[PDB]
Design a protein around this ligand. Structure first.
Ligand SMILES: [Zn+2]
Ligand SMILES: [Zn+2]
Length: 86
């Protein structure tokens, strides 16, 4: 699955390993926001879940807008789990 599918199914030993703690991440961005987040209460991830269906939104405003045009869950989803080592 080269030059066609990447990320979907590919386990890559997180090259970015935080120095302050024993945490690792795939993309720097992750290890960049993790520090300013944990090591610093300044950075705060926007977590807003809908109420009509139950979707996820990384923006208070955006979400609110969606709710308006949101019809509902129109189904039963929200169940997954992958117990593995890596
Ligand atoms: Zn860290
Ligand atoms: Zn919704």
């Amino acid at each position: 699955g080269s030059s066609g599918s990447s990320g979907r199914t590919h386990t890559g030993e997180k090259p970015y390993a935080c120095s302050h703690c024993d945490k690792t991440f795939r993309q720097k961005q992750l290890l960049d926001m993790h520090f300013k987040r944990y090591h610093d209460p300044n950075f705060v991830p926007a977590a807003f879940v809908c109420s009509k269906c139950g979707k996820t939104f990384t923006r208070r405003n955006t979400m609110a807008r969606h709710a308006d045009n949101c019809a509902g869950p129109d189904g039963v989803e929200g169940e997954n789990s992958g117990p593995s080592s890596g």
